[PDB]
Design a binder for this molecule. Structure first.
Ligand SMILES: [Cl-]
Length: 193
């Protein structure tokens, strides 16, 4: 196993293309920019086909890509109180009304919330208030073999650690996004250039 990354340049060696999966998106979420932008447009709903994959209650969407057995890095730009960014497993219950169907409410999902005043780390209904931020751009690092999920505030070439989770990774994971409030928006940064 390599040295852990330190500089933005080192994280960018693990740059991985993420896109939102329209088959998962809650109807109150609009996808744009070739599935690299998601907005909560409540009360404007979008005519997605009914699918078993689609979230019913929670305003969530997953990545098309799964992450399994390597190191990965992607950046997102986030806007609005009530956004969560994290990881989950395919088995997350898409139709569930309970918090076990949201990415802050079960033992196989890990997430970072911006609540309007602070960042908060979530795992299985347990919350950890955090000091760092706010930051409009986050870097999300997944070391699948090393059982690490870490979030950084990115400003120019500076990276400020927001939180580092220790994760017991077994299954493939998906990036997971929850836009709980009207006008919440998340863009996947094109790290291509
Ligand atoms: Cl919601």
């Amino acid at each position: 196993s390599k040295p852990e990354p330190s500089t933005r340049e080192q994280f960018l060696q693990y740059a991985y293309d993420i896109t939102f999966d329209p088959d998962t998106a809650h109807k109150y979420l609009r996808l744009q920019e070739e599935n690299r932008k998601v907005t909560n447009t409540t009360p404007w709903e979008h005519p997605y086909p009914d699918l078993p994959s689609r979230f019913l209650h929670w305003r969530q969407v997953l990545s098309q890509q799964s992450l399994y057995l390597h190191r990965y890095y992607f950046e997102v730009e986030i806007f609005g109180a009530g956004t969560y960014v994290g990881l989950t497993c395919k088995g997350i219950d898409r139709k569930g009304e309970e918090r076990n169907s949201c990415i802050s409410g079960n033992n196989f999902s890990w997430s970072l919330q911006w609540n309007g005043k602070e960042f908060t780390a979530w795992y299985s209904d347990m919350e950890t208030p955090l000091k760092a931020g706010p930051f409009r751009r986050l870097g999300v690092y997944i070391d699948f073999p090393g059982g690490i999920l870490s979030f950084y505030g990115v400003e120019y070439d500076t990276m400020t650690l927001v939180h580092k989770f220790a994760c017991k990774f077994s299954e493939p994971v998906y990036a997971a996004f929850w836009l709980s409030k009207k006008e919440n928006a998340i863009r996947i940064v094109d790290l291509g250039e």
